[PDB]
mmCIF file with all atom_site columns, C-alpha atoms (C1' of nucleotides) in Angstrom:
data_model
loop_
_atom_site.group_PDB
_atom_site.id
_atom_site.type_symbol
_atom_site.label_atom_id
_atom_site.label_alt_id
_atom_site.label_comp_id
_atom_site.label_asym_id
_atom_site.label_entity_id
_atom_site.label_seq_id
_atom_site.pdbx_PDB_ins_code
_atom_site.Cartn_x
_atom_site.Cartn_y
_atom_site.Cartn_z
_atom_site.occupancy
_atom_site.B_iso_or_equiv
_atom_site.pdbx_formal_charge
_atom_site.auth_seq_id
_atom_site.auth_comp_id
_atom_site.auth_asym_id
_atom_site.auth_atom_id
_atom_site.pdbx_PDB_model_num
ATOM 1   C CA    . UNK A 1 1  ? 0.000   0.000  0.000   1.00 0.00 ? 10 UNK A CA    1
ATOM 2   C CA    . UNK A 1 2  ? 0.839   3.974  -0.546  1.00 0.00 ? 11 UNK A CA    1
ATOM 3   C CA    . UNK A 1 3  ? 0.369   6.776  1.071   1.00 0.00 ? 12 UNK A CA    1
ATOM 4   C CA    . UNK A 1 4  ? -1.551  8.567  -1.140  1.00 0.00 ? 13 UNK A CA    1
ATOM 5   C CA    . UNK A 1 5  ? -4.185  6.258  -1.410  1.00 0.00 ? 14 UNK A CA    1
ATOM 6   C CA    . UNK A 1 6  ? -5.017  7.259  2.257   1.00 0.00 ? 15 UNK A CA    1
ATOM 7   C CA    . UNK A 1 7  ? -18.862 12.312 0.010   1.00 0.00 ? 21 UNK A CA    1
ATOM 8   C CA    . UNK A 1 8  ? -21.422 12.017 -1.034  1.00 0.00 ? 22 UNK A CA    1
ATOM 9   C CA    . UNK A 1 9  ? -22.240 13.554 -4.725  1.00 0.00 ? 23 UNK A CA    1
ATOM 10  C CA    . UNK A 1 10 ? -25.474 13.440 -5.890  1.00 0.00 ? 24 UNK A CA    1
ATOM 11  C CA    . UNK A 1 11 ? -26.043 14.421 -10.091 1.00 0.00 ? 25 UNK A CA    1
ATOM 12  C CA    . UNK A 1 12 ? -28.428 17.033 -9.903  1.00 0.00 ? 26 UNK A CA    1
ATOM 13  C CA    . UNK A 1 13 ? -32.326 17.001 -11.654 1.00 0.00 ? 27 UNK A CA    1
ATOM 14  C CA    . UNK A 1 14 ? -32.792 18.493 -15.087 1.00 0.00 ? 28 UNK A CA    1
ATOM 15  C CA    . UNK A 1 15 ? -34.616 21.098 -13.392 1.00 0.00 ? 29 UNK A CA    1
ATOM 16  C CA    . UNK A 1 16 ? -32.113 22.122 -11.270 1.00 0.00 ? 30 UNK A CA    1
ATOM 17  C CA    . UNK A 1 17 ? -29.512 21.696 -13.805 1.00 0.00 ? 31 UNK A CA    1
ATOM 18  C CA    . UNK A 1 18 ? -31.721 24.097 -16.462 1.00 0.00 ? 32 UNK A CA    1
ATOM 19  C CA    . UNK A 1 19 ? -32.169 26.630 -13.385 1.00 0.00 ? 33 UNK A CA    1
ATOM 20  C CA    . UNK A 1 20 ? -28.739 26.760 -12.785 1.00 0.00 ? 34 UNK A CA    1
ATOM 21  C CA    . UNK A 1 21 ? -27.638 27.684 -16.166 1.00 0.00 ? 35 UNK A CA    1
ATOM 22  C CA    . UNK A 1 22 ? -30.759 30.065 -16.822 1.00 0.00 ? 36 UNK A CA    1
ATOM 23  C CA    . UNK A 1 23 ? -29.034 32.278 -14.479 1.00 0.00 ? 37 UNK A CA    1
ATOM 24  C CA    . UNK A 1 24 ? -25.292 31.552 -15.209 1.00 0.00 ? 38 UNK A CA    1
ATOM 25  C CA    . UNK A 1 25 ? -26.439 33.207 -18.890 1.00 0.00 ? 39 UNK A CA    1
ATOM 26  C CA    . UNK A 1 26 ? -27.803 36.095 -17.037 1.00 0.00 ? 40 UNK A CA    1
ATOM 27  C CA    . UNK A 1 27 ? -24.701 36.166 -15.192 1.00 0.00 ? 41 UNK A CA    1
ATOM 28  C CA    . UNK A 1 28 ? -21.558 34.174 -14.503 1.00 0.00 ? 42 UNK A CA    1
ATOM 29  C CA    . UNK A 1 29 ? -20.889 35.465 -10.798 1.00 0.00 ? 43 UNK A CA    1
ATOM 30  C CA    . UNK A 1 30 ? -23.677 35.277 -8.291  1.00 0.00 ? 44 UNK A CA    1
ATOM 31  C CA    . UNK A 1 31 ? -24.389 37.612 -5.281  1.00 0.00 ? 45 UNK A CA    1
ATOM 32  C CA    . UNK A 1 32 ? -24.575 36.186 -1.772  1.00 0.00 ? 46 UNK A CA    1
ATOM 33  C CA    . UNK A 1 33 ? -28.769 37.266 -2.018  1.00 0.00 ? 47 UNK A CA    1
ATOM 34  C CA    . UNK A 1 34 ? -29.459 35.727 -5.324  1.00 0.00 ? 48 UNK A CA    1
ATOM 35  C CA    . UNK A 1 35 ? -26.958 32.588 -3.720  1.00 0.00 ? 49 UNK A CA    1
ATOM 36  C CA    . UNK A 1 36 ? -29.927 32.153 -0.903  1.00 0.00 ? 50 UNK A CA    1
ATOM 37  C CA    . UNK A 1 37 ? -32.917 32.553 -3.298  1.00 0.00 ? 51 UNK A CA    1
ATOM 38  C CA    . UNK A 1 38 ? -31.726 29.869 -5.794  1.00 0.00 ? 52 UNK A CA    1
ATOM 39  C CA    . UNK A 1 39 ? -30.774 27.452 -2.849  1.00 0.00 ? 53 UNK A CA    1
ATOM 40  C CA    . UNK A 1 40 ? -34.358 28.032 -1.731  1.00 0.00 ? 54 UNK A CA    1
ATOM 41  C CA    . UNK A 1 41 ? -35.587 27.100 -5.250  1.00 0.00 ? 55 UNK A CA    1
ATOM 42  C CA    . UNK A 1 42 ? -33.539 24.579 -6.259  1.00 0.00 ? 56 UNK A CA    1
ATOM 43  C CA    . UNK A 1 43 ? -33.770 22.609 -3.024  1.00 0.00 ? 57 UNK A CA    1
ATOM 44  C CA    . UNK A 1 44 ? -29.626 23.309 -2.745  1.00 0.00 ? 58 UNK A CA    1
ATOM 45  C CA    . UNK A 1 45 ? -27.359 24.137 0.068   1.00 0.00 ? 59 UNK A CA    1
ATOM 46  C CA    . UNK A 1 46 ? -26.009 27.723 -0.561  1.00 0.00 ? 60 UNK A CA    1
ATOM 47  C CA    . UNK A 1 47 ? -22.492 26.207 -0.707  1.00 0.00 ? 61 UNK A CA    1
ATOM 48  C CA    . UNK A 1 48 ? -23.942 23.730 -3.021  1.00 0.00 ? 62 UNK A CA    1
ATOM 49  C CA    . UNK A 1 49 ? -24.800 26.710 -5.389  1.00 0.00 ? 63 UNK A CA    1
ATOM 50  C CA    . UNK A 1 50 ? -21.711 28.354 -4.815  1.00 0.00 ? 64 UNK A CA    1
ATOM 51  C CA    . UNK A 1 51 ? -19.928 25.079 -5.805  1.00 0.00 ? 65 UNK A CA    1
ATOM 52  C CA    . UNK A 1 52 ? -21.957 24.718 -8.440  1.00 0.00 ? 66 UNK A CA    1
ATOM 53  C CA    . UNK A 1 53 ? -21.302 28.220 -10.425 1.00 0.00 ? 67 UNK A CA    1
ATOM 54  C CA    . UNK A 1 54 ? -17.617 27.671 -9.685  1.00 0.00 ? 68 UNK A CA    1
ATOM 55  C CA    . UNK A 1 55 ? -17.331 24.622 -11.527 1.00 0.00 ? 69 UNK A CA    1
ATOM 56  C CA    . UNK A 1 56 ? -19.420 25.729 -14.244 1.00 0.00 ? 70 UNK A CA    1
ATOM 57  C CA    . UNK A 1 57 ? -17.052 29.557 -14.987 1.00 0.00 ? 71 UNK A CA    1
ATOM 58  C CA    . UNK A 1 58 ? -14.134 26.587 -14.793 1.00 0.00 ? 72 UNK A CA    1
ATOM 59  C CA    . UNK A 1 59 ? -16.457 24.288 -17.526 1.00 0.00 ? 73 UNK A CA    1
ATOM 60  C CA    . UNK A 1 60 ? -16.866 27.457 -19.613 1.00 0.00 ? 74 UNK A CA    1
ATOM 61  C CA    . UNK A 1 61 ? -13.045 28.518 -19.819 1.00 0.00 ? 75 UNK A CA    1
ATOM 62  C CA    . UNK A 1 62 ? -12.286 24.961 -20.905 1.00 0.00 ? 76 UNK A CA    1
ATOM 63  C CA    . UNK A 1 63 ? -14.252 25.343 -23.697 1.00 0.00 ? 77 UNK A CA    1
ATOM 64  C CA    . UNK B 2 1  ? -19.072 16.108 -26.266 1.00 0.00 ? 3  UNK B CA    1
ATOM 65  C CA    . UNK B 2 2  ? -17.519 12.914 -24.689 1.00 0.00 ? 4  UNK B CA    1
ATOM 66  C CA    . UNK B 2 3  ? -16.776 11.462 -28.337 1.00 0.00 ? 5  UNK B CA    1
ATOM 67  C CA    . UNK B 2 4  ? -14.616 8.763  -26.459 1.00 0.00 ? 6  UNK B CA    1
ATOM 68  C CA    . UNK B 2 5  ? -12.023 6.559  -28.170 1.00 0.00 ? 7  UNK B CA    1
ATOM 69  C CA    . UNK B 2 6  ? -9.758  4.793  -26.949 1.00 0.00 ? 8  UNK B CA    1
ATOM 70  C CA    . UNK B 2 7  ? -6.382  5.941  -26.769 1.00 0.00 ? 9  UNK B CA    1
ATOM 71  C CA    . UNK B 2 8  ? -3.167  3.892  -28.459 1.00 0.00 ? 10 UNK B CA    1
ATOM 72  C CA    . UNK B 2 9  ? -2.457  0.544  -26.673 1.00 0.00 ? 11 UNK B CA    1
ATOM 73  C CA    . UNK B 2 10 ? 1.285   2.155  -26.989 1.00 0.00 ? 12 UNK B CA    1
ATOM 74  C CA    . UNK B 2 11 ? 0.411   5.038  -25.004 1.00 0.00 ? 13 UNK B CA    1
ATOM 75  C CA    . UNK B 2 12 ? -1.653  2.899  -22.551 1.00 0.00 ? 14 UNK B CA    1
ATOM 76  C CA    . UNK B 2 13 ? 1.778   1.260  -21.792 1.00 0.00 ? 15 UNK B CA    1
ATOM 77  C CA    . UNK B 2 14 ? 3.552   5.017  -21.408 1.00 0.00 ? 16 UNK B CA    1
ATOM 78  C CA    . UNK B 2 15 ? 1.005   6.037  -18.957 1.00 0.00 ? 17 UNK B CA    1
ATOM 79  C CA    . UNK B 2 16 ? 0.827   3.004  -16.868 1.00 0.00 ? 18 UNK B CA    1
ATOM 80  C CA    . UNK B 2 17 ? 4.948   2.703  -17.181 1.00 0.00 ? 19 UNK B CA    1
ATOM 81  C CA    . UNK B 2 18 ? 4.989   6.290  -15.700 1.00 0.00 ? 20 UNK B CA    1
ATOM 82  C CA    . UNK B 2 19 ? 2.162   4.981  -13.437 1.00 0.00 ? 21 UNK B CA    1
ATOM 83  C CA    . UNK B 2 20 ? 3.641   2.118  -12.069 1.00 0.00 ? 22 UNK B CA    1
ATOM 84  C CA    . UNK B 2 21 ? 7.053   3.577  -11.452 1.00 0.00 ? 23 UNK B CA    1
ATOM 85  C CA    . UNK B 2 22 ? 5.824   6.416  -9.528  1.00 0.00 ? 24 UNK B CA    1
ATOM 86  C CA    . UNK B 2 23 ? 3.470   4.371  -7.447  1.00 0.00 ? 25 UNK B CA    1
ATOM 87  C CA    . UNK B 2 24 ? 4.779   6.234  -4.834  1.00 0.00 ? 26 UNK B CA    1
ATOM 88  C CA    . UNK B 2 25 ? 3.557   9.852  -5.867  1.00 0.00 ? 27 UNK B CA    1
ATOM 89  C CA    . UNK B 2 26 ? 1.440   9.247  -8.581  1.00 0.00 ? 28 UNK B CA    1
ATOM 90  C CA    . UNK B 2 27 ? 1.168   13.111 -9.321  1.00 0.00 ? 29 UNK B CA    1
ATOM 91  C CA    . UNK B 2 28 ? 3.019   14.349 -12.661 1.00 0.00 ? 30 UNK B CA    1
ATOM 92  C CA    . UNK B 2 29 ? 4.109   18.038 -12.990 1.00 0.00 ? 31 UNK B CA    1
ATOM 93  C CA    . UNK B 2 30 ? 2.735   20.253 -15.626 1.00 0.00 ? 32 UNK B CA    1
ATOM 94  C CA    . UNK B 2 31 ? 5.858   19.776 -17.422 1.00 0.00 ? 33 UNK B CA    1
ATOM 95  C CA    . UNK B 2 32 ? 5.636   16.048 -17.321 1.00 0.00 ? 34 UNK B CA    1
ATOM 96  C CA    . UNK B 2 33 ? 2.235   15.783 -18.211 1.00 0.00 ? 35 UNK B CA    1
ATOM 97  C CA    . UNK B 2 34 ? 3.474   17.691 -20.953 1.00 0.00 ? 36 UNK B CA    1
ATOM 98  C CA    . UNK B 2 35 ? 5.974   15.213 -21.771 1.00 0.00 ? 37 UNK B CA    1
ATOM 99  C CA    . UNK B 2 36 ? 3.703   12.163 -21.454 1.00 0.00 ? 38 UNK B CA    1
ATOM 100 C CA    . UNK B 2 37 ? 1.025   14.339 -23.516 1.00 0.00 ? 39 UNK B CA    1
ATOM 101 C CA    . UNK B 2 38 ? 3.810   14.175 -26.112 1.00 0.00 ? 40 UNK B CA    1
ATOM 102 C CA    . UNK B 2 39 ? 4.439   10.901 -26.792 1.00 0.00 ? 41 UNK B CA    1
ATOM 103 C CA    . UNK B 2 40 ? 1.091   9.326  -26.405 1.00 0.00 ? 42 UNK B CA    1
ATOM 104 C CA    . UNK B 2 41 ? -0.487  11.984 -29.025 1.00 0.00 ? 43 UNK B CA    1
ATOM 105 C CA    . UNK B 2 42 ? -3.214  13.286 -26.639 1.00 0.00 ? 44 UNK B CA    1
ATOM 106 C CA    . UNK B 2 43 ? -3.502  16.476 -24.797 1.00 0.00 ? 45 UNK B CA    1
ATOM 107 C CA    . UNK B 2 44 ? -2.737  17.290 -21.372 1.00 0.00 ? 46 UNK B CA    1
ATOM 108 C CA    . UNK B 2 45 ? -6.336  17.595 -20.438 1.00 0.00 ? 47 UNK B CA    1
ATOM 109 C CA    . UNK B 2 46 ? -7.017  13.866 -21.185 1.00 0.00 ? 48 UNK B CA    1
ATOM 110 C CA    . UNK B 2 47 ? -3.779  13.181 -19.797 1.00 0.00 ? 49 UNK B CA    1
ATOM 111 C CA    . UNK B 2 48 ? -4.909  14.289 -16.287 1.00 0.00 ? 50 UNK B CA    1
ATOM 112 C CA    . UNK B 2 49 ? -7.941  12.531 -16.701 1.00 0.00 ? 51 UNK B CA    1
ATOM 113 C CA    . UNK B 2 50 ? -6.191  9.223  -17.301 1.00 0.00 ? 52 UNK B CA    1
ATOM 114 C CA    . UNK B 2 51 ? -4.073  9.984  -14.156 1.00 0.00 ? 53 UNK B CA    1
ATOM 115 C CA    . UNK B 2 52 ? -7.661  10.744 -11.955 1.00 0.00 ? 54 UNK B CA    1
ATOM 116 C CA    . UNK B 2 53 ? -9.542  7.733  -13.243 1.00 0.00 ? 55 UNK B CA    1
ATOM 117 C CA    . UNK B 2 54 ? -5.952  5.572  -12.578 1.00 0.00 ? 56 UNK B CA    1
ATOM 118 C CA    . UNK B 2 55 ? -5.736  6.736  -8.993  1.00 0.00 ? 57 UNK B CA    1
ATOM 119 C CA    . UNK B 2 56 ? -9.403  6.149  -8.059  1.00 0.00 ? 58 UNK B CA    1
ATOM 120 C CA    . UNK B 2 57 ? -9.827  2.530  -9.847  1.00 0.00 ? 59 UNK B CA    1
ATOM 121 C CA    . UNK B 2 58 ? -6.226  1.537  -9.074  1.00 0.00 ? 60 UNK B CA    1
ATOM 122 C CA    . UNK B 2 59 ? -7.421  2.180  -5.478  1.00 0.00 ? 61 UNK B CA    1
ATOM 123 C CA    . UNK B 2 60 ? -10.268 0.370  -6.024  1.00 0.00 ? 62 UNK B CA    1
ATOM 124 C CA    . UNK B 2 61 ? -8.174  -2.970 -7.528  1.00 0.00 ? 63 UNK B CA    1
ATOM 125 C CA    . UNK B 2 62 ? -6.708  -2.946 -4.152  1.00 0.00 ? 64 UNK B CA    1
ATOM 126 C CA    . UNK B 2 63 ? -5.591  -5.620 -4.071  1.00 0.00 ? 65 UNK B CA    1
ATOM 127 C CA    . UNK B 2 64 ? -5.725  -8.726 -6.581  1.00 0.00 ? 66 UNK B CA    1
ATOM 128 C CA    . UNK B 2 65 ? -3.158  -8.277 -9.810  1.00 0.00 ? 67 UNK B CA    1
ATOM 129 C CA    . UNK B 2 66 ? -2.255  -4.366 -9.338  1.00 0.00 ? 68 UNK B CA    1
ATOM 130 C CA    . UNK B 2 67 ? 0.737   -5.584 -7.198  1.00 0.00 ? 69 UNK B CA    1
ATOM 131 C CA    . UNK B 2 68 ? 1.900   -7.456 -10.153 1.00 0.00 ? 70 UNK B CA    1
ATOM 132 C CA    . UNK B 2 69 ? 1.412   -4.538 -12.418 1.00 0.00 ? 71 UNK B CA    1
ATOM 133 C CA    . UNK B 2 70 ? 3.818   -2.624 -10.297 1.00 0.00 ? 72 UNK B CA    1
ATOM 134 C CA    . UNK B 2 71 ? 7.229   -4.326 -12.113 1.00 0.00 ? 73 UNK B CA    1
ATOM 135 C CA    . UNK B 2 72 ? 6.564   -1.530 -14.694 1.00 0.00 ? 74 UNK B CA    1
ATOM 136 C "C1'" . DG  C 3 1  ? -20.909 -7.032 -19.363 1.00 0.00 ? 1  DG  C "C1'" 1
ATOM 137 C "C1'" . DC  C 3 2  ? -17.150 -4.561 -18.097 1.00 0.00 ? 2  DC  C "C1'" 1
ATOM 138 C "C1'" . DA  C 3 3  ? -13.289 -1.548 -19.504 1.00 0.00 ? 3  DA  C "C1'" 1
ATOM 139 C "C1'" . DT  C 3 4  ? -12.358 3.101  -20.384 1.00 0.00 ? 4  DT  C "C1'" 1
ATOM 140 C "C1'" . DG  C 3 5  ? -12.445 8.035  -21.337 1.00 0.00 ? 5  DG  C "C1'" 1
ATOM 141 C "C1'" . DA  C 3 6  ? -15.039 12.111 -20.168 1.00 0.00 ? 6  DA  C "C1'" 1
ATOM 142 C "C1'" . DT  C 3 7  ? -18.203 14.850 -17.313 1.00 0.00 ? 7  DT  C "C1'" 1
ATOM 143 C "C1'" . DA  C 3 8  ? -20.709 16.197 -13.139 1.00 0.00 ? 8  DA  C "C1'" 1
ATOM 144 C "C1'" . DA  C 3 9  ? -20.601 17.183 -7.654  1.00 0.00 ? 9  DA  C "C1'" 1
ATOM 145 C "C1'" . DA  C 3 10 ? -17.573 18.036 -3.946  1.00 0.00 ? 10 DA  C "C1'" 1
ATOM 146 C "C1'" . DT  C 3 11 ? -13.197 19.148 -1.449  1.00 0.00 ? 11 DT  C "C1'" 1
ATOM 147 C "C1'" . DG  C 3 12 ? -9.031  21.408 -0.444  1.00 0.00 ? 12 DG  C "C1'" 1
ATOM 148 C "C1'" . DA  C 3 13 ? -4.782  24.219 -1.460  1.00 0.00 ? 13 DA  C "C1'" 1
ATOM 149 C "C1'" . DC  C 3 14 ? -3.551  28.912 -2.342  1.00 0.00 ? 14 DC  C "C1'" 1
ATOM 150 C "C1'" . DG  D 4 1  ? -12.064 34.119 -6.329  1.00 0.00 ? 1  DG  D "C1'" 1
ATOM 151 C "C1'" . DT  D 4 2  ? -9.109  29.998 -9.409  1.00 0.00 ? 2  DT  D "C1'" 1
ATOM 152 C "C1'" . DC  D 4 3  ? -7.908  25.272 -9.955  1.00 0.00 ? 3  DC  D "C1'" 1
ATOM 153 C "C1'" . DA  D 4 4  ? -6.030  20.557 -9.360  1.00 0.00 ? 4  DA  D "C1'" 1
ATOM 154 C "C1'" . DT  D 4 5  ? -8.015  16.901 -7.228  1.00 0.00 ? 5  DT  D "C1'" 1
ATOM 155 C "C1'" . DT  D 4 6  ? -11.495 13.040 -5.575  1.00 0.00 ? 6  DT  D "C1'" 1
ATOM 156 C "C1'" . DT  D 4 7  ? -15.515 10.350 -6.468  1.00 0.00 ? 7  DT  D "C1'" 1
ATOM 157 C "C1'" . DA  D 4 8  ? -19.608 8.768  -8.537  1.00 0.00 ? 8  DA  D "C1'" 1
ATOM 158 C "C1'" . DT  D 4 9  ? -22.282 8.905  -13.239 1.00 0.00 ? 9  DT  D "C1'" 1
ATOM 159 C "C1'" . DC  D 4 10 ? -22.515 8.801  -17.742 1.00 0.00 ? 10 DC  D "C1'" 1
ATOM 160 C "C1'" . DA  D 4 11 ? -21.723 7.384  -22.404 1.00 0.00 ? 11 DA  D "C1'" 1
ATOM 161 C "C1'" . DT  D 4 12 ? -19.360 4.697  -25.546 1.00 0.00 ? 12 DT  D "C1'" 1
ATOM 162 C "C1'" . DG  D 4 13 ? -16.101 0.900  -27.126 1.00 0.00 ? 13 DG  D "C1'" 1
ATOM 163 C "C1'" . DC  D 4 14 ? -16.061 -3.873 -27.748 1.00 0.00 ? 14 DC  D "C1'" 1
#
DNA sequence: GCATGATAAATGAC
DNA sequence: GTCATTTATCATGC
């Protein structure tokens, strides 16, 4: 064994998903207000949003 | 999107070669991702993928025939 | 029916 | 904040 080889995600509903990117369009960076009202929405944690819009500005550069 | 193909069973050998004989830190640099990038053809993007799937299932094969695979 | 490469959540370093 | 990861899902090869 190494030492380096020494949860829980959950894919997300289409609705969420389509939610999610309805307002990444509108814009990329989200305020800590609109953070809370989307969590409240889309059922989310507002670290789980947060997460979420970081991964996708990441997503978008790659492309 | 995701138009996968399998990658040259000569560069399969290159990344597990690399793989297996840094077992200990299994964690390339950016230059020798380059390197590896390089002489199996891809890109260094599907190079750190192979590296993040290896870890993870590598973990997973612990342990039946991985120990074997580590005379690379 | 699994192997394998790529993508989607989630974490941690900086 | 970015960004390399970990891990589970997904989609495709065969």
């Amino acid at each position: 064994l190494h030492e380096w080889t020494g949860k829980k995600r959950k894919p997300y509903s289409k609705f969420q998903t389509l939610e999610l990117e309805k307002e990444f369009l509108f814009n990329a960076y989200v305020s800590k207000q609109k953070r809370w009202e989307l969590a409240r929405n889309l059922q989310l944690t507002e670290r789980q949003v947060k997460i979420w819009f970081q991964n996708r500005r990441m997503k978008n550069k790659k492309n | 999107r995701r138009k996968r193909r399998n990658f040259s069973k000569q560069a399969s050998e290159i990344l597990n070669e690399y793989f297996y004989s840094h077992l200990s830190n299994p964690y390339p640099s950016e230059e020798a991702k380059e390197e590896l990038a390089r002489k199996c053809g891809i890109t260094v993007s599907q190079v750190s993928n192979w590296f993040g799937n290896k870890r993870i299932r590598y973990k997973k094969n612990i342990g039946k025939a991985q120990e074997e695979a580590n005379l690379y």
